[PDB]
Design a protein around this ligand. Sequence first.
Ligand code: FAD
Ligand code: MTE
Ligand code: PM6
Ligand code: MOS
Ligand code: MOS
Ligand code: FES
Ligand code: FES
Ligand code: FES
Ligand code: FES
Lengths: 164, 164, 745, 51, 151, 305
Amino acid sequence: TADELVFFVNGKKVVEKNADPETTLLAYLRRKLGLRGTKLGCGEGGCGACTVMLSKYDRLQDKIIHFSANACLAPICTLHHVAVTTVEGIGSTKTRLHPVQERIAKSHGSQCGFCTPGIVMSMYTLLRNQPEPTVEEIEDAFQGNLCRCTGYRPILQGFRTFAK
Amino acid sequence: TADELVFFVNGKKVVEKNADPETTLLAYLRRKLGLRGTKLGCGEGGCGACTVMLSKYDRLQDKIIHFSANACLAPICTLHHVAVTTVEGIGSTKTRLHPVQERIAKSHGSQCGFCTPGIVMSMYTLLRNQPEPTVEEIEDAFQGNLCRCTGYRPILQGFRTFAK
Amino acid sequence: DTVGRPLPHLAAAMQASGEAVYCDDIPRYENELFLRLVTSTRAHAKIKSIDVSEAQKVPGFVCFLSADDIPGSNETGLFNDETVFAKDTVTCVGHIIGAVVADTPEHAERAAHVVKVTYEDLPAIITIEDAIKNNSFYGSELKIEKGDLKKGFSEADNVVSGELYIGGQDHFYLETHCTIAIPKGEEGEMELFVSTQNAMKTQSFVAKMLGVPVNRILVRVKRMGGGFGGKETRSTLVSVAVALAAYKTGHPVRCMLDRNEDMLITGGRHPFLARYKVGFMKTGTIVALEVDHYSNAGNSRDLSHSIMERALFHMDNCYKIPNIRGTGRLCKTNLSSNTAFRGFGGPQALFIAENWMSEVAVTCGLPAEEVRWKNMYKEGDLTHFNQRLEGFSVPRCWDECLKSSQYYARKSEVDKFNKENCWKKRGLCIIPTKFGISFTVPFLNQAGALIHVYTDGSVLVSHGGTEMGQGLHTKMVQVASKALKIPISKIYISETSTNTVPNSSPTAASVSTDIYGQAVYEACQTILKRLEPFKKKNPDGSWEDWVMAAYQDRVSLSTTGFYRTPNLGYSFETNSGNAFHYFTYGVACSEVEIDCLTGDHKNLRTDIVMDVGSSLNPAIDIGQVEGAFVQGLGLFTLEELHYSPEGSLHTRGPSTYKIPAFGSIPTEFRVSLLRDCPNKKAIYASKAVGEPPLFLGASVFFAIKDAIRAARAQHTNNNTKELFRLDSPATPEKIRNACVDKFTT
Amino acid sequence: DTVGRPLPHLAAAMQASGEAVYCDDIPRYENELFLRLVTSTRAHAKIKSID
Amino acid sequence: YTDGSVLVSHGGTEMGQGLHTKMVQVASKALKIPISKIYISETSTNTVPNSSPTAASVSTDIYGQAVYEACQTILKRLEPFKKKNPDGSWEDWVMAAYQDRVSLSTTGFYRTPNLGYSFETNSGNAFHYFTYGVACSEVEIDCLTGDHKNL
Amino acid sequence: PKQLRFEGERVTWIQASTLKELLDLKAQHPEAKLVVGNTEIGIEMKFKNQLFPMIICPAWIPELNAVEHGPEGISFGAACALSSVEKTLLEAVAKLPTQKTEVFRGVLEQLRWFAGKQVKSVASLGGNIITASPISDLNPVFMASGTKLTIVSRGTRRTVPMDHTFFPSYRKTLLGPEEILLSIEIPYSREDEFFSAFKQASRREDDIAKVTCGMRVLFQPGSMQVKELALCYGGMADRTISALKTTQKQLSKFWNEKLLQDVCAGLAEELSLSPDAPGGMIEFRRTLTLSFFFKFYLTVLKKLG
Ligand SMILES: Cc1cc2nc3c(=O)[nH]c(=O)nc-3n(C[C@H](O)[C@H](O)[C@H](O)COP(=O)(O)OP(=O)(O)OC[C@H]3O[C@@H](n4cnc5c(N)ncnc54)[C@H](O)[C@@H]3O)c2cc1C
Ligand SMILES: Nc1nc2c(c(=O)[nH]1)N[C@H]1C(S)=C(S)[C@@H](COP(=O)(O)O)O[C@H]1N2
Ligand SMILES: Sc1ncnc2[nH]cnc12
Ligand code: MOS
Ligand code: MOS
Ligand code: FES
Ligand code: FES
Ligand code: FES
Ligand code: FES
């Protein structure tokens, strides 16, 4: 008497047979699937520690679209046939880092490290929509991402390397 | 299309809705109920490390009967309306130790300690059947219990205090 | 040998891939339960009943916990004036009454929200003003006094007096408080994984509450996603609560706070009220000063006495003042207990000093840089607390900052911009700072390390300090590598634990690199000595050879190491003996543009010259300067806590509390470390960096004030030599209202 | 000062109550797996396939 | 620790022989405090590195000695406090050493002396000393079955 | 592509695949809640404490996602994300002449420092409107321009320009219980028509006391004589309000120093707050309402003589 929810996380199929409408994506990734890359910073949409990339084929537009989103507010029930990418989906110290990850690390753009997964997924979303962005597009991709350690200079300086 | 299994463990009700006929009691206490007092020594009925007490009302006899048994061989499926007592059921350092536990401890009858819960349950069963046993009944209650550390003398000396 | 090289933080790569583990990232046991605090909704009241019948209907519910369930002691806190769980009477809005335990954190949240408490209200004290008139203080007046105050004032050309307020600040570490507690079932043993800077007191407080020797309790700390002082003591509120739940249920238990819970419960920085009077000459030379400080301490003592002490020690900034009395008082109020926050009372006292200073410049009608400079200490001067200033490098820092910021040239531009613009103004200010290095409590200045070398020649280091992003472990690995003369890839640090280094001070006061650096260094020397004979027997072999011959010859490859800071011990009578080991110095210059019609502003440019002696890692150090400064710019301009009349906090998330963002920072942001200035007094000639820079953000505050003055000169009156009151933080409300014009009126 | 006195083994009481923890008595993680060795049935031989 | 409780750790493991019990009895006599003040929790490679396997019957001898050396070091550091407050308790001396920034942690180590037998030369000590004993037993056998009683 | 059902401990969720399916459901269940981005509903369930046992998700429906370019203006489906609206409007603005895009440039301004990309990718247009926050940055702009709303139910269908009557009390809108918002038409500006939008920087309480506004003036052909005037403000009351009494008085008047004076006197007077008004900041807010107009007043002049 209840439908199955079917979505994708890091290219792998998830078939939820007993979805609860109250379940957040954040809670599902951490506590059901065991992927703790994505973090809880506030639960109310303002810090971005929980940023993921969403992908879907737009039945209207005809295209595949990639956009960023707060896992703490996304109900898993809005995600039937959506694809999720988390920080562990784009690279790893066990295999190879994605350039976004490499650059932020080596530019001293990470200190305590708790907001880094979220900033990495905001930059990566920007790159998948626009492979060669402007400095201006770069600064703007971060309005929903907070960091309390760095004062921001080293993160922009490191990512500005992707522009022109 | 499958019946519920109902039994008691340490005076508390267990309602098993999906009993598998292959499941041993030993596995059920340890891995389903989290009570690890009862130990795996051999899996074939020779060592007694897994000894428990079983209690039932005998529909023929008219009485309640108490007898000891090997948890490693007892299928949970033979246990509908049976009461299980384990080492954690008779006494604890958190509340108070049963005299069986006290006397073995203080008589130096426990060294590595792995066989002690099972020896404890054999003595206790004997006492519930016969509050004042002979020396002979005592020696005999242990043919199914092996100890590799103590050479037995101190366990008999300690327990022989319950006789005449 | 990497000491002095820009080596990235050792965990940075794993932080960027999501592989580094924080406390709540640790997997759960199959039987692991969840805790949620139940908290007061009243400032001050008798508890008349607690009803849990609704909470019992929630699926997964396990039990409610309260003061009755405690086997040991419900007496806690740094001075033993706190309860673990409140008994009959609550004393602030987030006060802890009990806890709920359930099978999921969702179930815990749902059950806690539904617990009914009945209260009978008692009259309350919230403000500093309320505390003064009701005389509500902890302990008695603190004081420092030098010279002759009468006489000072009797020879002054001029006097100025007034009142200043500075609001508090929430820590907003990106990761909130968090504990896991695992009960063993033997002998009271318990192992805890916790986000704290003070594994020592966590262990003490848990054991006291339990009624159990300290040797039963293991506390382990891998890393913190931020601390900033808010994890020096206040993390025990969650820690002890969770321990009790594990004791009582016999299961593993955890709890991570939601933001809204963290801001209400765990405390922030002390707000300060100041009443001041300065006497000076026509030249701008200072000649007498008198300050009474009041802090808002909340419903317990905690660290409030020490914070007041560091404030009094800093009321001079970089200025020589021959006649001076500073006093301090701690206000006892019905609000969450305030505690350590980066600076520790130093930024508050420093801000009060720069405010009267800016009023002396305006009253005299002289330029500010000139009045600030005339009044500086010189090499070798004593402070108001009679400590000698050696290697006093503010004059250098000042000079290079003026030159590389092009201060005077850009000052002309500002005046020009102000003559040509009507409803927008610009400001430019330049500010010095000094900061004393050491715990003001002599006995906390101790540190231990424990090093093993294994038979493969790999080395495990463990010290009393914790990682919270500041790069402490990175630095100790650089230290060990240089001391032992082997590459960093042979050395590892895993975690901080009470069973490898005991009795350790909280990771605080900015001294960690100094003290643990030294302790790690002593352990290395002992290892080198023991290895020496084998090096002589095989001069042309490798590290691995010497280690394995020492092992086969039954020479031990394990040793402790210890350090104790020398010659510390200031007295409040006598007014003497050193309170600090040395001082850290810097200078910042900032420029802003305000919108007079909205209260909005832009940070156009900032230049900083900071003295950190010879840096162990320029990249970490420059990172520490930028972080600290931006948090200061938050304290003085953006960030504001706001309560109801009844003492209840309104600001509880990122949407009502604004910490600096990507676009908050100055468009042109420039930091230099001063060159050629080794510190004789600390490891490899370096200096503490963590807290000293934060105060320099005030340069943005005083650039904004300078811009309010020119707006005022445009639209209000003709009294250049006019003083007006501007409190911290200068939000847009404060900025617009101060720009009195044809609309405000 | 107990040196020379018949002091019982310090864990004896908790061995007698089943509260003393041995290795398999440690609780399992929610994701914890299990292993079983696969072992030779010959004294001496070439392994020609594993299916 | 600052409450005056002590955590001991050594390279040896418990397997029923009572090693920990004996180390606790040793520590207690060496420090002169009751046994209820001392605890051992487990054996771990991050507290004592490079240890020999618990074997050859020497564990009590060799870990006893090492525990004994650690205690001496503790007593020496606590000595000046004991002189200042000769009628105080253990707890008082511990807390005054702490507040005066004297460390309350130490290693301890022992190396058996004069060992090293040679298969050439046929000399040098192989053992530190010898343990000795004597047993007498009586049995009854059943010559028809192979069975026996130990009398 | 069909309708899906999810059952929870407390909640039933229906994903509607079709306009029909939705209107049927809103008819059978008038108390049900519509969820698109969850950036409001999620907050009410976690913090403000609500429980809504029945939720309907209309995101899949085309119509509600449609973007249409008519002669009167541009129409957006109610479920269109804020970044789609932004993207479409940036494009119309880089392509049509200035005199036609004054309302569009207002909307884009309110959308400048309005949350981050993550939120703007899932927040729906219809969601911001129907939530009816006293501090909504979009409603004041929509009101001052009479942006047209298409409202629909099983049976009914109507198109009203938004005006002051659309928000009757704290957090309610003039829709019936069975109704849904279907689409929103943002107008082109005409000849002699000018527009501005402004918002107070920070923010301190949840959904009160943040001054935000939309401002519109229409002149007689080629002249400087007012024909219509609209000034709508958020953060001044418990809903979006218009300064009707003040603007009404300026009809026929000329754009000069004296007009500046009377609207300020009119605003100070019409919008005043008691000293104990919720949210505080009493003088600052008043000053903003005048100051925002002063800016508008100058911006219009620069755009004429
Ligand atoms: C961190 C953050 C920052 C924000 N900043 C701002 C800001 O700066 N300015 C501002 O104005 N707002 C701001 N908001 C509010 C935000 O823009 C709204 O949450 C959003 O637009 C609502 O869209 P939604 O689809 O997510 O609404 P939902 O949460 O899904 O639902 C919202 C309401 O609209 C109703 N609804 C939705 N569709 C229809 C329909 N078509 N017909 C009838 N009713 C319908 C629902 O029943 C529900 O009651 C912010 C929110 C967050 C999370
Ligand atoms: N990234 C980061 N930097 C930080 C902190 C933090 O929590 N995160 N804490 C600050 C504070 S309050 C102090 S006291 C020092 C403490 O560490 P140290 O003694 O090793 O500098 O780090 C400072 N820098
Ligand atoms: S001075 C100082 N600074 C920071 N933390 C402290 N704790 C105790 N004294 C302190
Ligand atoms: O001394 Mo840092 O913890 S404020
Ligand atoms: O030497 Mo005993 O371990 S066989
Ligand atoms: S957790 Fe802060 S935005 Fe999702
Ligand atoms: S590094 Fe600590 S929050 Fe960004
Ligand atoms: S395990 Fe040896 S008999 Fe049951
Ligand atoms: S004590 Fe070791 S087996 Fe009996």
